[model samples]
Target chain A: AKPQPIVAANWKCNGTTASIEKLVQVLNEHQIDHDVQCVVAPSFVHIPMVQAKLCNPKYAVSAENAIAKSGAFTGEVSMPILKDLGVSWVILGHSERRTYYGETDGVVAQKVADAYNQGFMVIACIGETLQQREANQTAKVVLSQTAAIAAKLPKEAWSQIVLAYEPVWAIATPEQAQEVHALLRQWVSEKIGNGVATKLRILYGGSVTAGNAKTLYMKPDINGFLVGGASLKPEFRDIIDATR
Target chain B: AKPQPIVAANWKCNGTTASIEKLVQVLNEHQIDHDVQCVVAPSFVHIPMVQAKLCNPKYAVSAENAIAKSGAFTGEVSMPILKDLGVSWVILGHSERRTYYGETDGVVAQKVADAYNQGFMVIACIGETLQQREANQTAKVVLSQTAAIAAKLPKEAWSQIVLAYEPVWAIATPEQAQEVHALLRQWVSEKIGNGVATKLRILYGGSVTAGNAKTLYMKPDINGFLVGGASLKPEFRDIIDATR
Candidate 1:
């Protein structure tokens, strides 16, 4: 259950038909590499287009977010709906959701459980704010968020969950992210049982570019990145190949 | 300046590709009627599918909600994204969003303004809960929500907004809805200016179905319905024809 490096793009709230179609046309050119996993997340409106066009076996489409269930919630796209749309991967609990949408730890945990129940491959994101980091409460905040989801299910359930640690308010350095990844690994190693830590993929979600992707991927615990800015650009190809 | 009756179906968080395709297929069979406009609002995931399939010119597509701008806010779809998707209409300030997602009156106002600015025709929803109605605060609550949106733009700008009053937490009767719609119309007539109220189309959105739609439509102030349950059924055609 060792972590295969994954460079997943979290296309948060951006993309148009023209831009997404163009981006996917370029992304479809990616050569297959089973050693690395590449996922592109698009906004809810654009998912069908992305899923249909992004045809490389190496590339999978992901929803930026999804509601746990369907019904009575106006404006919320449900997991069943995502499932029906042929999307299996969903990125939840992103810092952007936690901050802008007031998604609490409990809320994120429930979302993970519900999404997992709906047979979704979940990328669950956690992070400390700049304030939490400055206050020396980074570990507490990060672990507390992780623990919320952990409490929802057993260690084996985590096989379906990918952990993403995105420093919410800062563009973290590789050194800073490496240390946090190590700590997170230690936390998982101790808490989730003997071999589960090795199975889990913890991605660094601070701003990633092709230039920095290699440096960040070299860290022992940082499996890869949950990319934002560079995901929309052609350079995403190079970033995905950082491990090579 | 007289109102044309609009029967808008808010699909909320329901529909699979099969279900939506089937529903739209049935809806597409509708005959043309310039006197009535029918709109189907599917969840963001299903919008592309609905927009593709629902071909009746008398029918249009609507988004359940939209973020004011596109960027950084994870899980939120932007107005620009909706526009690019060929969606011209968006429903804002629905009670579900206000209650579940914490959309304040100010937040709804911002959404309406931003959606309007992006050339979207707005269906702005306002509702009073059972407790507010019991406490004799229905007018205050409803007007406050409308006032918030009104305060954002000049009277002319309101031409783009269709007011939808849906009572939260209670299935309101026609008498109850008619009174509230009258109050709302009066408030708009007095606040928005002499001609603005006459031009505005006010809809009754209290658990609309084919059975209750005609009764609700018969009220002078209840110009149309922002429909819910009956929208998914074969009877949605009946609900759309209540005015006939």
Candidate 2:
């Protein structure tokens, strides 16, 4: 089977209804790559407007974060609402949420359990920081985070999960992949075994761009990207076209 | 001047796209009490569409939470975009953001500063929990939270700011407001001074409904409300009417 490479457009708190409409208009002009699937994760504020326009399956919608399933938790977006909105994908355990909001792997696991219970596919993210990598504990950190989810889920559920190994420190800064890519690919192969590693679409997130896009995409296990800032513009189309 | 009582419908992660439009249409069918200003805080997914239909100044839109100003912060809404959309109000420092996501008083104060800088009127929220109230630290706790922003703001800026005192344990729960209402009113008067508190519009939140709505609004310093679950329903009119 040919690789079903996915290009995720992580809006990263950018755009309003008007801008999303403009984005949709621009996208309507381009012929999408048959092999690539396009997904847009707009801020919760813009999800409805964007969802109305994306009726087809090729274009999907996802929530950037949720209240970790359900509860009496006030002011949180729940899984049922997400499901009702036709949102099939969710980005879990992002570094930004982890660093600033004290999101732990345990919380991510609860969210994954809720998403899976609601029959939603999840983009399960796990990554180490520069300090962890420099300390030669990258494999240790990534596995620790992944192990939490693995324990909560069965092996079959792995197919529904997409692993993204994003370096926390490099998320927005100048520390582009370089030595991290090789380490990440090796880490995945060691943890889940090469069989699952090859089957699953493991993405390199954080600071991914057109300049380094091709180089990063060339890595063995770095299947695609979850581009943040650069993905907001037409350059994302270029980034997708590069995947061709 | 008529008491410009501000009422917000904190939709609290409820409502689909279709439901939001319907809610807007229903709300528009009748004239609200002229003395009150009405706003809806829809789920982030529904904000933009809900915002588009509301063109009247008396009717406005607000985001439940905004991403810290700018940059590659994922899964967040921004104040600049809300300003561009002509959103007049923003709800910040709610209990849910603090308890679940770890929002600090300093961060919320920064959000207040950012929203004011963007020229959006603020409903900056502050309150303590059942624990704090029982310990008699509600006064001290609320003062610290409010002081963080009070020191940073200009004297003239008070006109654009409304302090919403929502005790944590009562919000979206079955708990009833007891002596806390009087204590909160007294605290606001002392902490913010009579001049600001007289015009400040301190709102009492947490599970407020039509039954106790009149009583809550009757309190001398309790000028309005930041209602949760009930705000999504037609009952919001009663909450708005209670202030009269």
Name the runs in model 2 displaced over 4 angstroms. A16-23, A52-57, A70-75, A169-196, B18-22, B53-57, B169-194
Worst 10 residues of 2 chain A by lDDT: A171-180
Model 2 residue A140 CA deviation (Å) reads 1.0
Score candidate 2 by DockQ: 0.50
Give candidate 1 regions above 4 Å deviation: none
For each of the candidates, give the backbone clash count: 0, 5
As for candidate 2, its interface RMSD to one decimal place is: 2.2
Model 2: lDDT of residue A160: 80
lDDT of 1 by residue, A19-122 (tens): 98899988888775659888888889888888788788887889988888788999999898888888999998998788779899999999999988888889
Please write out the lDDT profile of model 2 over residues A1-244, one tens digit for every residue: 3257777888876886677787766665677655777778887767777777765456788888876444345456777778767788999888888777677889888888777767877887888887987798876788788778777886667678887778785543323453554555555567667666567776777777788777666655566778788777777877777666
Error of 1 at A213 (Å): 0.7
**TM-score of model 1 vs. true structure:** 0.98
lDDT, candidate 1, B78-189, per-residue tens: 8889888899999999999999998999999998988877888899999988888889999899999999999888667877889999888595678988998889989988
Question: TM-scores of the models, in the given order?
Answer: 0.98, 0.88
Top model by lDDT, which number? 1
Which candidate number maximizes DockQ?
Answer: 1
RMSD of each: 1.4, 3.6
- What is residue A211's positional error in candidate 1, in angstroms? 1.0
